[PDB]
Amino acid sequence: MSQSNRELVVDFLSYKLSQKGYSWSQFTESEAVKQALREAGDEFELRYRRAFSDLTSQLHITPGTAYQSFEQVVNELFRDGVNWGRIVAFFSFGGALCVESVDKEMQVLVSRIAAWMATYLNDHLEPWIQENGGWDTFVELYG
Numbered sequence: 001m002s003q004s005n006r007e008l009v010v011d012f013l014s015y016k017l018s019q020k021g022y023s024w025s026q027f028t029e030s031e032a033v034k035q036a037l038r039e040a041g042d043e044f045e046l047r048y049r050r051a052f053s054d055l056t057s058q059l060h061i062t063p064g065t066a067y068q069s070f071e072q073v074v075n076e077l078f079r080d081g082v083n084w085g086r087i088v089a090f091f092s093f094g095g096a097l098c099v100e101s102v103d104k105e106m107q108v109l110v111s112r113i114a115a116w117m118a119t120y121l122n123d124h125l126e127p128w129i130q131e132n133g134g135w136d137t138f139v140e141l142y143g
Ligand SMILES: O=C(O)c1cccc(-c2ccc3c(c2)/C(=N/Nc2nc4ccccc4s2)CCC3)n1
Pocket: 048, 049, 052, 053, 054, 055, 056, 076, 077, 078, 079, 083, 085, 086, 089, 090, 092, 093, 094, 096
């Protein structure tokens, strides 16, 4: 479902904004997915992210930025195709984009990034997810 993905994105972003000191007011199997994803994002940010180039310096979102610009940049996470670890990085990257947005007084962009993330997730990532056991398999691995 594309609506459960939308909830999933919103859940992750709300968690990230709260954790980092900002307002989140910008907008069971499912809870198991959200919690494992929140947890995996923290782990990635804490231990893994710094091994890579900072993808946020490739993208400066303003109210005029088009989806396609976001899409092209996120595409780099998937230069070698999709795996769960890059999917997790994808969420963290969205969260970082949102934190930076709220920080520079462009909090309106948070809901747009959310929409962008759901769109990107629904067409580029979801086919690999369904092929590789769906989100329940993610919970088995990362929960
Ligand atoms: O296991 C893997 O293959 C894996 C796991 C997690 C991430 C990645 C991966 C693969 C390719 C790239 C990356 C990560 C990149 N990461 N750069 C990031 N920069 C930031 C900055 C903030 C929040 C998240 C991120 S993710 C940019 C360069 C291209 N690969």
